[PDB]
Amino acid sequence: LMEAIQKQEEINFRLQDYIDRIIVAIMETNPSILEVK
Amino acid sequence: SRDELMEAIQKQEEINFRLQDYIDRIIVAIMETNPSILEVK
Amino acid sequence: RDDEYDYLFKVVLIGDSGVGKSNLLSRFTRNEFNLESKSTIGVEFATRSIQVDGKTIKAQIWDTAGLERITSAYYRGAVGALLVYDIAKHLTYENVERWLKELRDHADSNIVIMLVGNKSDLRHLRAVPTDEARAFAEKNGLSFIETSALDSTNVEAAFQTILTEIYRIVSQKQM
Amino acid sequence: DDEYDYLFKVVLIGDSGVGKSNLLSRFTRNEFNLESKSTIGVEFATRSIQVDGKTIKAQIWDTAGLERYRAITSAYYRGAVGALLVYDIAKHLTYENVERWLKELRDHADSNIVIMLVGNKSDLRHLRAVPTDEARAFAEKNGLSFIETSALDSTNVEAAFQTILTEIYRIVSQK
Amino acid sequence: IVKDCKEADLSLYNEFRLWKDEPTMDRTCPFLDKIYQEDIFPCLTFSKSELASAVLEAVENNTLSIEPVGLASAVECGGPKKCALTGQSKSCKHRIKLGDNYYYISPFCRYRITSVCNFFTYIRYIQQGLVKQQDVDQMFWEVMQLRKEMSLAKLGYFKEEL
Amino acid sequence: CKEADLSLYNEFRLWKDEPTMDRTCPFLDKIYQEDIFPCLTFSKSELASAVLEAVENNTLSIEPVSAVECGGPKKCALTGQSKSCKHRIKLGDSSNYYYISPFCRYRITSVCNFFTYIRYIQQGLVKQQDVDQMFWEVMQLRKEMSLAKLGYFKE
Ligand SMILES: Nc1nc2c(ncn2[C@@H]2O[C@H](COP(=O)(O)OP(=O)(O)NP(=O)(O)O)[C@@H](O)[C@H]2O)c(=O)[nH]1
Ligand SMILES: Nc1nc2c(ncn2[C@@H]2O[C@H](COP(=O)(O)OP(=O)(O)NP(=O)(O)O)[C@@H](O)[C@H]2O)c(=O)[nH]1
Ligand SMILES: [Mg+2]
Numbered sequence: 081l082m083e084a085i086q087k088q089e090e091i092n093f094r095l096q097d098y099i100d101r102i103i104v105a106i107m108e109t110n111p112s113i114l115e116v117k
Numbered sequence: 118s119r120d121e122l123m124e125a126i127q128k129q130e131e132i133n134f135r136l137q138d139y140i141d142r143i144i145v146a147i148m149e150t151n152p153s154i155l156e157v158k
Numbered sequence: 159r160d161d162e163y164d165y166l167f168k169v170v171l172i173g174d175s176g177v178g179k180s181n182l183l184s185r186f187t188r189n190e191f192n193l194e195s196k197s198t199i200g201v202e203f204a205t206r207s208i209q210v211d212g213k214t215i216k217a218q219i220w221d222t223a224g225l226e227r228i229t230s231a232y233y234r235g236a237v238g239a240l241l242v243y244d245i246a247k248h249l250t251y252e253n254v255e256r257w258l259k260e261l262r263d264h265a266d267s268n269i270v271i272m273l274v275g276n277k278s279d280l281r282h283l284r285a286v287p288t289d290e291a292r293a294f295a296e297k298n299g300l301s302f303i304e305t306s307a308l309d310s311t312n313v314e315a316a317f318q319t320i321l322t323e324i325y326r327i328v329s330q331k332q333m
Numbered sequence: 334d335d336e337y338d339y340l341f342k343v344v345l346i347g348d349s350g351v352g353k354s355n356l357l358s359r360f361t362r363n364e365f366n367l368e369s370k371s372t373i374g375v376e377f378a379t380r381s382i383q384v385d386g387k388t389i390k391a392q393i394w395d396t397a398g399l400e401r402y403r404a405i406t407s408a409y410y411r412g413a414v415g416a417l418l419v420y421d422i423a424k425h426l427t428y429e430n431v432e433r434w435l436k437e438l439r440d441h442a443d444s445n446i447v448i449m450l451v452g453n454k455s456d457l458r459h460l461r462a463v464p465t466d467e468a469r470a471f472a473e474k475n476g477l478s479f480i481e482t483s484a485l486d487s488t489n490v491e492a493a494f495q496t497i498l499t500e501i502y503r504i505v506s507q508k
Numbered sequence: 509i510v511k512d513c514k515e516a517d518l519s520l521y522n523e524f525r526l527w528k529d530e531p532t533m534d535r536t537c538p539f540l541d542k543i544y545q546e547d548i549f550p551c552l553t554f555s556k557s558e559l560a561s562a563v564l565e566a567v568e569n570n571t572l573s574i575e576p577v578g579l580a581s582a583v584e585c586g587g588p589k590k591c592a593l594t595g596q597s598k599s600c601k602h603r604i605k606l607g608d609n610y611y612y613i614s615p616f617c618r619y620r621i622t623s624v625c626n627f628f629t630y631i632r633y634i635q636q637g638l639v640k641q642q643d644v645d646q647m648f649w650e651v652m653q654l655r656k657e658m659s660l661a662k663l664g665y666f667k668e669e670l
Numbered sequence: 671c672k673e674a675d676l677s678l679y680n681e682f683r684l685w686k687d688e689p690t691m692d693r694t695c696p697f698l699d700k701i702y703q704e705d706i707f708p709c710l711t712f713s714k715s716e717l718a719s720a721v722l723e724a725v726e727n728n729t730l731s732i733e734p735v736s737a738v739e740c741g742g743p744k745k746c747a748l749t750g751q752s753k754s755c756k757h758r759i760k761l762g763d764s765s766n767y768y769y770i771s772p773f774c775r776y777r778i779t780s781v782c783n784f785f786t787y788i789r790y791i792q793q794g795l796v797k798q799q800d801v802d803q804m805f806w807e808v809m810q811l812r813k814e815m816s817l818a819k820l821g822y823f824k825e
């Protein structure tokens with residue numbers, strides 16, 4: 081049960097390192113993607 | 118350790134959930150316009 | 159009715175997590191405030207056009223998570239920055255010094271910096287007397303303003319100001 | 334040089350953990366990772382090959398093996414002229430699901446899409462759950478090419494792509 | 509060992525959820541009367557009785573404001589060593605404003621007053637709500653926390669930032 | 671609970687630092703003598719010694735499912751027993767399926783599992799596992815063989 085929190089915190093580490101890398105690239109070419117409005 | 122076992126995984130799984138839904142949505146957009154982004158190289 | 163623009167200015171929001179950056183953004187762009195809003199994931203920007211000296215200025219307001227540790231890309235091309243703290247959390251103000259370092263490191267010089275100034279709506283909770291900050295603002299070469307995204311006070315004014323000051327600086331270098 | 338005569342988009346599909354991501358890494362950059370974690374988002378890497386004197390640029394798309402459904406299958410399969418349907422020789426369930434993937438293809442991807450069945454992790458010979466005969470048999474009756482690969486020891490990874498690519502070449506060549 | 513738990517007093521909850529469905533700032537409703545007598549009034553009981561009920565008016569109108577004062581003339585207004593509400597002499601790091609003159613205030617007094625102000629702020633957030641993604645249950649337990657705080661200040665248990 | 675035998679722990683920790691598949695090194699000798707050899711001991715010794723070679727060489731393979739020694743669904747090739755055999759063994763290039771009892775299957779896969787993990791380390795290839803984690807995996811691998819050695823198996 082306590083081993084579950086160690087692995088899902090490791091998932092955040094993996095998910096976020098992904099979002100960062102992808103965001104960097106998106107800006108390096110077509111940042112229009114990142115518009116909200 | 119007590120009832121604090123279920124509150125750490127409850128909020129952190131919900132965060133992962135939103136993180137993933139974000140990743141899907143932008144990936145779709147990325148594919149809809151400039152998919153060159155998703156190359157490894 | 160125009161849809162076309164004379165100038166395109168990129169302005170970035172920075173500051174400790176929870177000072178209200180995202181709401182400053184939403185309030186300015188779509189006049190919406192969310193009391194229960196969650197932490198901002200990834201990077202976004204929204205746009206709005208305004209009139210300054212007869213010319214239409216298209217503002218590109220970028221937002222991201224205040225907790226930081228992709229910064230280079232974020233500040234790039236930014237001609238303006240809103241450095242935000244929580245009037246009611248002295249700690250987010252203490253960190254204003256830390257944010258200026260990241261600013262004067264990864265962002266272009268000549269960048270207009272405005273100090274905000276947020277959650278002015280909580281009157282009984284104020285930890286940062288206006289003067290202590292306003293002084294800090296003038297001595298470090300920052301404009302300064304106090305806003306509440308919650309009650310709408312000065313949010314519009316804050317953007318209108320930093321935008322015209324960016325207009326003024328770019329028109330004059332053009333002269 | 335960087336020119337190519339044909340550009341073929343080939344997608345990797347199959348149950349999570351059958352080794353799609355490593356088939357990709359082995360073929361495109363001749364690298365294998367024993368410890369690799371699950372694939373987030375969507376990627377593709379390219380490699381050019383010679384087929385009938387003409388230069389063929391292969392665009393190998395890879396994605397999270399966990400599917401049956403969300404949100405972006407339409408785009409992933411779009412323009413795919415080839416598909417590597419992968420299972421784990423040592424986990425029978427992944428072979429069991431092969432039919433479901435053929436369904437997935439028969440729904441969201443173009444017909445005439447060349448499909449090859451792999452066939453992977455052949456290096457574990459004591460763990461084999463899927464006798465080759467049965468797989469080869471299933472493939473032929475269902476109009477599929479078939480091969481067994483190991484991304485770990487490199488066996489047939491090369492041959493596998495070379496095959497699906499030249500067979501895609503011929504169909505594009507005839508018309 | 510003993511564990512800390514929570515369960516709603518059905519009386520308070522039903523009294524509340526009824527109020528939630530038709531919110532009012534009216535002092536005389538069932539919801540606020542209880543809360544006024546049990547929490548608000550006791551919190552704002554001070555030596556200078558003229559000024560005390562005066563602060564209450566400021567709080568109800570959200571015209572009250574509190575600034576810190578990094579270190580004119582009157583017995584009122586207080587000073588760094590003397591509180592305006594209670595006559596005690598202690599270092600006052602905060603200053604109160606009823607409306608656009610400054611009155612000096614002790615840290616104990618501040619906690620009592622802000623504790624009340626937070627209640628009014630959430631009560632007001634709900635009327636003009638502005639409260640969307642929080643179910644009524646969570647809202648209720650928010651109100652209890654607000655009450656716990658006032659109830660603690662009521663009895664002389666407060667918090668100081670240092 | 672579990673606690674590392676320092677004697678074994680040091681031996682392994684050194685071996686990991688300069689990995690060898692040599693049957694004669696201290697690390698492997700001990701395990702061969704104590705685990706592998708006894709695990710791969712069968713009644714019909716001719717096929718048995720062939721199996722040992724296939725495992726070391728990774729040419730042996732095990733699949734689920736008119737020759738005499740091959741055995742059949744009711745008879746095991748390695749041990750002379752009559753039991754229902756749901757798996758068949760194939761040695762390198764040989765093309766012959768020998769039926770194997772569920773008891774035998776456990777003993778062989780236990781050994782094949784030890785070797786395939788060791789091989790992963792020698793060409794490692796294991797980058798994310800602490801030295802301690804790696805050690806206890808070897809202990810686990812040895813524990814299995816130690817049970818299979820004695821006739822305690824899983825199906
Ligand atoms: N009282 C009050 N609360 C405010 C104000 N502006 C924002 N908040 C609240 O402050 C909290 C944080 O707001 P948010 O805009 O999400 O902060 P943030 O700067 O976006 N955080 P992050 O940088 O991590 O995205 C929210 O609960 C929001 O409603 C304001 O002017 N007054
Ligand atoms: N023995 C062996 N292991 C392999 C082989 N290919 C992959 N693996 C292992 O099994 C796992 C497969 O990982 P991966 O290639 O990411 O599979 P996947 O298809 O990408 N899964 P996902 O779709 O979820 O990303 C990895 O731990 C890898 O080390 C192979 O040919 N042989
Ligand atoms: Mg934000």
Ligand SMILES: [Mg+2]
Binds near residue numbers: 371372395396397398
């Ligand atoms: Mg993958």
